[PDB]
Paper text:
Doublecortin (DCX) is a neuronal microtubule‐associated protein (MAP) indispensable for brain development. It contains two homologous globular doublecortin (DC) domains—NDC and CDC—connected by a 40‐residue unstructured linker (Kim et al, 2003; Cierpicki et al, 2006), followed by a disordered C‐terminal serine/proline‐rich domain. Although coupled, each DC repeat within DCX appears to have a distinct role in MT nucleation and stabilization: CDC is a conformationally plastic module that appears to facilitate MT nucleation and stabilize tubulin–tubulin contacts in the nascent MT lattice, while NDC appears to be favored along the mature lattice, providing MT stabilization.
In these experiments, rapid (30 s) polymerization captured 13‐PF MTs in a transient state that we initially interpreted as GDP.Pi‐tubulin, but which could in fact be GTP‐tubulin (Estévez‐Gallego et al, 2020). Strikingly, the DC domain density in the rapidly polymerized WT‐MT reconstruction most resembles CDC, while the corresponding density in the 1 h MT reconstruction resembles NDC. Several differences in the CDC vs NDC sequences are also visible in the domain densities, in particular the relatively bulky side chains (Leu and Phe residues, dotted lines), which further supports our domain assignment. Both CDC and NDC interact with all four tubulin subunits at the lattice vertex, but with distinct tubulin residues. The interaction surface area of these domains with MTs is 1047 Å for CDC‐GTP/GDP.Pi‐MT and 1603 Å for NDC‐GDP‐MT. Can the distinct properties of the DC domains shed further light on this idea? The conformation of the MT‐bound CDC in our reconstruction is substantially different from that stabilized in its crystal structure (Burger et al, 2016; Fig 5C, yellow, root‐mean‐square deviation, RMSD = 4.3 Å). Specifically, this structural plasticity could enable CDC to both interact with curved tubulin assemblies early in MT formation (EV3A and EV4) and be retained on the nascent MT lattice (GTP/GDP.Pi state). CDC mediates this activity as well as the initial stabilization of the nascent GTP/GDP.Pi‐MT lattice.
Author numbering:
A (entry chain B), B (entry chain b): 1 to 429
C (entry chain C): 178 to 264
Amino acid sequence: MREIVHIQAGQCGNQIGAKFWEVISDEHGIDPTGSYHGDSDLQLERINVYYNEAAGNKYVPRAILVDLEPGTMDSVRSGPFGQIFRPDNFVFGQSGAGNNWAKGHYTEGAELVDSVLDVVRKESESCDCLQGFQLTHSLGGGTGSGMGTLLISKIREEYPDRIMNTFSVVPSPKVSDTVVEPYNATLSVHQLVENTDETYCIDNEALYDICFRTLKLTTPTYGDLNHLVSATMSGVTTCLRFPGQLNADLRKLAVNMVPFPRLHFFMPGFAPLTSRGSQQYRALTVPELTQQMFDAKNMMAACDPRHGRYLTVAAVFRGRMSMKEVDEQMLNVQNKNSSYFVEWIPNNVKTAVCDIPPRGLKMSATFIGNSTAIQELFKRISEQFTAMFRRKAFLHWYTGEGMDEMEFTEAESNMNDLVSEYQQYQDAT
Amino acid sequence: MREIVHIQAGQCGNQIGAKFWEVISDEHGIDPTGSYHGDSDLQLERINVYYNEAAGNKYVPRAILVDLEPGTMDSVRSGPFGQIFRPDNFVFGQSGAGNNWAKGHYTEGAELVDSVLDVVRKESESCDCLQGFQLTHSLGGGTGSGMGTLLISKIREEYPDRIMNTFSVVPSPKVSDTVVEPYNATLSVHQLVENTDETYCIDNEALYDICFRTLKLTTPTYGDLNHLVSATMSGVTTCLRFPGQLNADLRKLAVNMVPFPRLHFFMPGFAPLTSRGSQQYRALTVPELTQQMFDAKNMMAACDPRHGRYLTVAAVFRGRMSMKEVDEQMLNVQNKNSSYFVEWIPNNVKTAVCDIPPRGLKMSATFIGNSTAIQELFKRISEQFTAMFRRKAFLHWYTGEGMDEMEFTEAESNMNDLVSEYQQYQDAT
Amino acid sequence: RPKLVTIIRSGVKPRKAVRVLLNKKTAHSFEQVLTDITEAIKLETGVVKKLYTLDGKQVTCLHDFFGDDDVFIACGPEKFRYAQDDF
Ligand SMILES: Nc1nc2c(ncn2[C@@H]2O[C@H](COP(=O)(O)OP(=O)(O)O)[C@@H](O)[C@H]2O)c(=O)[nH]1
Ligand SMILES: Nc1nc2c(ncn2[C@@H]2O[C@H](COP(=O)(O)OP(=O)(O)O)[C@@H](O)[C@H]2O)c(=O)[nH]1
């Protein structure tokens, strides 16, 4: 039971799953053909969450992939673990996004969405007990910014009780991958807070320095940057899929993580991170994992937790370790870092202990942070937004695709109404 | 016992049997010579329904083939399974139809019918216990539109108690194979409702998209389109010919399917449909077969079941599966699709379970639908009829072969009296 | 700058009134819109020759006949059907 339908969108949203589904299938011993090769019977205890069991003792990933051009979909099947997907789920257009939010939401998005929402529904009838949907996209491009949000506004009308979480890619602070990424941010962030229960923000820029200052990788390609995205997503659902002493799921990580229902922008962290030339000099102790998480250079977003206070902290643990030993460390970091947490919330640390470690290690963890340091992440977007919009710059493509100025004006102040909440809860007593 | 005499008519009516009789003989292990090569003794339990057992331990198909020219009959014997037919049953003229209903019913039809009705009678004396006759023809051509209906008006006078069913080919909505197909439709549909107990309407146009959107065939020729016609006809008589737990026949599929005796136009469906590049990713479960039938793209007729309500639903199952498991699915689709069925009929779903699966698969089914969505199928014909007839266009060939205007006027309003019944029973309470 | 109008097909009623863009940058002739609409709609013949109004009263011939926020109907070789689509 508790199945989760996985949905992807965008060029960034596809190639993450080519790394993500490689990691999940290797946690259960699955070849790229699709048969079984594991040794322990624990691996098939909760296999049905990401696998509909087909005939011939095969397994298919309950996954739907969306693009507006086939230039990326054929690149998935021609790589490793590309044979595992069912060929009926690749729903795609022919023209392309044009890196436009208006074309990703009104022009080509209205046509392709009916060929997706029946496929979700065809998986929904196959859901024995649906838990919620997860989405992987970006916020700066054309497809993952618009076509993902066009699904969410139609999914939430079909499923109000079901949870919803997006592993989006927030664009970098300083370097710019996309010219029109401030327009793609604000017009999509206005849609995220309407119909998403939580969001795990990932920056590109912070993942470079994690793979450079800590892993010391000489040539970090996408086969290693997206690997840390997969370690985050597998680090959340690892209590739903294996017997642990203290269970957790996306239901427990929603109400215990979001106390006010519009404040649901998170920050993930991963630990430990041993380099290939530095793994043989580190103590593998449980308090070693705590002091590596709570700094700045392990966050997966361009944020300064020294400027801001946390509200809810979820640390999902894997392996075999004492319950009292972890909770002493979680209490001690609340005492010494008393300025770093908010005053009016007791027991601001959530403990999740599983019993299956990641393959290749002995013990590990996964950090989920919720601080008011993301107000720098959005005001920097809104500062870039008001500079471009006051000149009516790059407006004759959005307006050329059926859009008015009042769409911008409500979406501009709603981000300002978002950040003004975070500053309000920052320094109260 | 319970023999069925198979009659064919038209160029379309002949080449279907070249695919149809290939399928039936392969369900009992019969070479194109005509001997026996099977392994199980179950196959010869009801072999006498489509086979008169001749001397030398051979078997002949109880089949009569009719054309108005020998341009197709010699093409049957020069292919596979063309040696199996008796050379005395090929009764054919020499001139040709001319693609004319008047010449297919009055000019050449009066001559050839006496050389057929004795052959039916010569098979009728060989009938140990006659069940009924089945006919395969079209409705747009010359021979299958007229010469088939000229047999039915003479058969029904000879056999009022015997059942009668025609696997006709209703012409396509948009593309036009025949110029005079609205005249060939209405002048034959007036004759079908007089002396046929049921009719299974098959469109050409819907069978293209079944072989393209679902089977993903690159080059669909008639060796694969007529194969789905054979899977329909074999999917009905599969309870009459093999021991199942809950039997069925054409007698049970007549009164339980037609509640008002003039409303006997059906729509067939077939399931499952696995492509050669998609068969290794599908679960072979019993509720998988149900959700594939009840959509639009599996119907074998240009119909929209979303606009219209069903009246009688017959699903004939083959294989080994639980009785309670099927009936839970048949009850559930009545509950959720409550607008899709008529209100004043309880138990509108007929269950037929056999125990012999089709060769090459493990489990299968066959859908028989009876909805009020065929009123679009006939009003589109009658709209094309009144446009051509008001100009007296293409009338100087029918009138040139002994036909008056009053033949059209009664036949025009009888189709309007047919469709006005369907709209009357559509939205009552 | 663009137009927010929509189109359905007549007499059958499954259509949910898709809203294609109508703009000078995407269209430069009235007859061009009559042929670009054909891939996103289905008719009997498919000749999108005419389009009648919201109530099918008058014919259309120009881009300047397009007041915002109204529904049109697929026409051509057929006639108006008195369809209660927007109800
Ligand atoms: N981490 C990561 N980011 C990627 C990858 N490919 C693209 N991106 C990011 O995706 C964003 C651009 O979105 P894009 O996929 O091109 O547009 P869309 O397909 O129209 O949604 C930028 O922020 C890129 O940094 C990848 O393989 N890994
Ligand atoms: N499915 C199918 N339809 C056929 C085939 N051959 C002819 N038809 C259909 O038969 C109709 C034309 O009838 P035809 O046989 O030429 O006339 P008749 O011999 O005088 O009754 C059209 O609707 C064709 O699509 C065939 O092999 N398969």
